[PDB]
Write a protein that binds this DNA or RNA. Structure first.
Ligand SMILES: [K+]
Ligand SMILES: [K+]
Ligand SMILES: [K+]
Ligand SMILES: [Mg+2]
Lengths: 153, 266, 68, 164
RNA sequence: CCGCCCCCCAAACUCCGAAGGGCCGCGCCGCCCCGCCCUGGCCUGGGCGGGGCGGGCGAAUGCGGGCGGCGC
RNA sequence: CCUGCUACACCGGACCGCAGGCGUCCCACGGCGGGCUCAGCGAGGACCCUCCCGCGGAGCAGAAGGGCACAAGCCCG
RNA sequence: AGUUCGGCCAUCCUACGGCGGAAACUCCUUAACUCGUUCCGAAUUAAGAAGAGAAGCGCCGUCAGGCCCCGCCAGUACUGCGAUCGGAGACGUCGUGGGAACACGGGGUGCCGAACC
């Protein structure tokens, strides 16, 4: 290393994606954020104010503060045998709403929906890790006959 | 012989601009500073006063930006002004003032339909008998029901002293809308006092009537060429202030919009 | 060409003793320094569909502006 | 045949490139157009050419109107209504230049003699679409002026004969 | 000078891009009401609480867990 | 103290490892608003001027990497 | 079908040929006043209605360049875990998991939302 400034080792991660330079689209400022929400951190390399350190690129956290211009996010960070809860202040161009609990809200809505419908017996609503296949018949009227081939060189 | 600038490598790396930037219809630097709002104001609507001019017409609109579009809450087009008694001269300084007055009155009457106590058209009824003086509806400062607040979005037009964009804003203020502004860029201001009589002259179309008066004096052959539509509605250049004053009163009374049912063709 | 076909493997043998390690001498099915086999190249020339550069041979265009 | 297709004279630029001769030169353009002319500064330094950098080198003025057309029938009358066939650019413009400036008119040479470029631009009605601030687009390819279209127009309006 | 082919290359070249890693989530939800106070044109929001209701334990495998003091 | 690489796609990772930089410079070379578009090729014009196309091939104090076009570059208040 | 304001930012771009216009948008006409051009009403600001589908714009076309999807390339390149497998080594092999890219051939060539005629 021998040199460890704030933006060291950032040649590729802070660069823009191919044919995606210039100003951010205006959805970056029309989204509504709320206390307790989950967010992803992704650094946009063209916006230099409130730009988080490279350690936080690609982490997921929770909103603790809603300020006039920036958001406050809590990140769990491992330090040498313990986890630390870190708090940072980041401007809007580097935050996106996160879908880490999207799958869980769809299931909770679907179980209460399928309960309301009762199909008179209640269906099994636990997730199932893929089971071994059941017994079945398959036709061998038309079967292909293959074999190893000879070396060609 | 000569190197070719548009190779297939030039095209592969080319990034297109936003569709409405390629068409030269939107500046996104100014659009970002209009719709921005503090994040502890989570989903409160924010409004813009949009004034656009074309050849043959002047448009005003009140608008709120949403995620995937923006809603027009109200709009007034100056081609409606023929019904209130203004037959010719649309897109001049007076016609821009009247159209902003139409849009402002129409919006406040739309938000006060049914409300009995302290409705937005009784509270802040605007102004009467245009003077061309400074006025600010948010000075009244009712404690419990504030004035409607909007911002002037002028787009690609130049913000010169005496542009028609600012006249249309002025008629919106005189109908009761809180639009923040200063008197600079109006006719009759000298950095040491703003004199309102000079501003009432453009408002009442006085510069138009003096041009016809002199133009008829020397070159009456051009007077037919220059103002043919004025002379076919038989409005003579001495009754404009007569004609504009009646028009404003007929606007405040019935701001409501009557929809022209229409038939198209491909 | 055919008048040299006998003596090329003798000259490749000479070069092999100047190079470290184990080397293999082989004869290819291609036509010269081109990319088609002799039989493939022969037929393509037989019907017309094969382009010619200077010392290299390509295929019919079949793409882009028709003529002009 | 079509109106909105007719060619007209867009503008005429008089350029004088050369201590106080530029002051004398500006008055000459001043008393030939009734316009304050401008002054250009030097991009580089060429001790071979004798100009430092950031310094008053040339002068020029743009003329737009029926005035432009009159000054461009006295400039040709000097050249005897004669123009090179190859003096017409790939984009519909042609130029020329005189050596003594009193060949448009006799003036007491006080202010000394000078020599100018006459560079003429033509256009059709519609070229505004590429200059206006809002909704700016390139003119269509057919609507532009080919050099063959430019020759047929000036010889009809003027009487130039194209020594080849 | 220009256009098409073509042999061969890069730790400080990359339009493409793995295996492999990393961070987060996997039970309490709905629906109507009522109270308190910076934010909005407003009869707007947002936060913290109260009630009345319907519900309800929603991947596998293993297993009890957390905090401090003094010191080598 | 700082950039790129060594470093094996989270973070971290050694050498008297590789190629280099810093102890300064600027009341404007700073803040804000408005306007404008650069490098250049091609084609023209008396012994700098004009048009056209122009994804930045320019510029942004000084290393290296990244960033930026009705601008973060240039000119004016 | 059209105009103003937008979302996503090329299936929407670039080049060259076409075809259209009742309305709409545009081009267009003018220098009294307003304000403006390192010079210039070119731009821009003001004031207008004689003329237009020549442009821009909408549409159609092209063994068009680009862009986008699919198949092939290929269980190949490379790689996690395990081996008292082979080889002087450099390197390769087998068991058990994951799995590209270039090239190549066919298809395609903006849609969604508020207000007004
Ligand atoms: K650390
Ligand atoms: K050997
Ligand atoms: K057209
Ligand atoms: Mg602005």
């Amino acid at each position: 290393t021998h040199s460890q400034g704030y933006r060291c080792k950032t040649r590729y991660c802070f660069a823009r994606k191919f044919r995606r330079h210039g100003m951010a689209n205006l959805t970056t400022y029309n989204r509504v954020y709320k206390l307790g929400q989950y967010v992803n951190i992704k650094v946009n390399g063209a916006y230099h104010k409130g730009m988080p350190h490279r350690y936080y690129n690609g982490r997921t956290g929770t909103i603790f503060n809603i300020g006039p211009r920036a958001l406050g996010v809590q990140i769990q960070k491992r330090v040498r045998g313990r986890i630390m809860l870190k708090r940072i202040n980041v401007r809007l161009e580097h935050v996106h709403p996160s879908d880490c609990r999207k799958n869980h809200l769809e299931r909770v809505a679907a179980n209460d929906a399928a309960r309301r419908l009762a199909g008179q017996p209640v269906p099994c609503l636990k997730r199932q890790n893929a089971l071994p296949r059941a017994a079945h018949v398959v036709s061998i009227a038309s079967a292909i006959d293959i074999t190893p081939l000879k070396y060609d060189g | 012989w000569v190197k070719v600038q548009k190779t297939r490598s030039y095209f592969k790396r080319f990034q297109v601009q936003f569709r409405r930037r390629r068409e030269g219809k939107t500046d996104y630097q100014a659009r970002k500073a209009l719709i921005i709002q503090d994040k502890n104001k989570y989903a409160t609507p924010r409004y813009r006063f949009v004034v656009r001019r074309t050849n043959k017409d002047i448009i005003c609109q009140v608008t709120a930006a949403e995620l995937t579009k923006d809603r027009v809450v109200c709009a007034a087009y100056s081609h409606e002004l023929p019904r209130y008694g203004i037959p010719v001269g649309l897109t001049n300084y007076a016609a821009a003032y009247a159209t902003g007055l139409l849009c402002g009155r129409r919006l406040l009457e739309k938000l006060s339909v049914g409300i009995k106590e302290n409705a937005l058209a009784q509270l802040y009824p605007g102004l009467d008998k245009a003077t061309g003086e400074e006025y600010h509806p948010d000075e009244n400062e009712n404690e419990e029901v504030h004035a409607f607040k909007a911002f002037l979005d002028i787009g690609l037009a130049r913000a010169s002293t005496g542009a028609r964009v600012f006249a249309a804003m002025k008629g919106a203020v005189d109908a009761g809308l809180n639009i923040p502004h200063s008197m600079k860029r109006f006719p009759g201001y000298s950095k040491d006092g703003f004199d309102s009589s000079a501003l009432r002259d453009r408002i009442m179309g006085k510069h138009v009537g003096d041009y016809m008066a002199e133009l008829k004096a020397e070159d009456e052959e051009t007077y037919r060429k220059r103002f043919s539509k004025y002379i076919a509605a038989k409005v003579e250049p001495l009754r404009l202030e007569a004609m504009y004053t009646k028009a404003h009163a007929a606007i405040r009374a019935n701001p409501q919009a009557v929809k022209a049912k229409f038939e198209i063709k491909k | 060409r055919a008048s040299a076909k006998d003596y090329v493997k003798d000259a490749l043998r000479r070069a092999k003793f100047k190079i470290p390690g184990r080397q293999a001498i082989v004869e290819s099915r291609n036509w010269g320094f081109t990319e088609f086999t002799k039989e493939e190249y022969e037929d393509l020339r037989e019907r017309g569909e094969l382009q010619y550069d200077g010392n290299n041979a390509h295929r019919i265009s079949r793409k882009g502006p028709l003529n002009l | 045949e079509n109106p909105m297709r007719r060619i007209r004279i867009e503008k005429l630029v008089l350029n004088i490139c050369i201590g106080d001769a530029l002051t004398k030169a500006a008055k000459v353009l001043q008393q030939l157009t009734d316009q304050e002319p401008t002054f250009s500064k030097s991009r580089l330094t060429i001790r071979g050419f004798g100009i430092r950098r950031g310094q008053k080198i040339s002068t020029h003025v743009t003329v737009r109107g029926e005035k432009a057309r009159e000054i461009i029938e006295r400039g040709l009358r000097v050249k005897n209504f004669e123009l090179p066939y190859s003096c017409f650019s790939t984009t519909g413009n042609f130029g020329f230049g005189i050596t003594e400036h009193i060949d448009l008119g006799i003036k007491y040479d006080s202010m000394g003699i000078y020599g100018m470029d006459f560079y003429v631009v033509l256009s059709r009605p519609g070229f505004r679409v590429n200059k206006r601030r809002a909704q700016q687009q390139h003119v269509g390819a057919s609507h532009k002026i080919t050099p063959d279209e430019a020759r047929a127009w000036v010889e009809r309006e003027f009487e130039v004969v194209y020594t080849k």
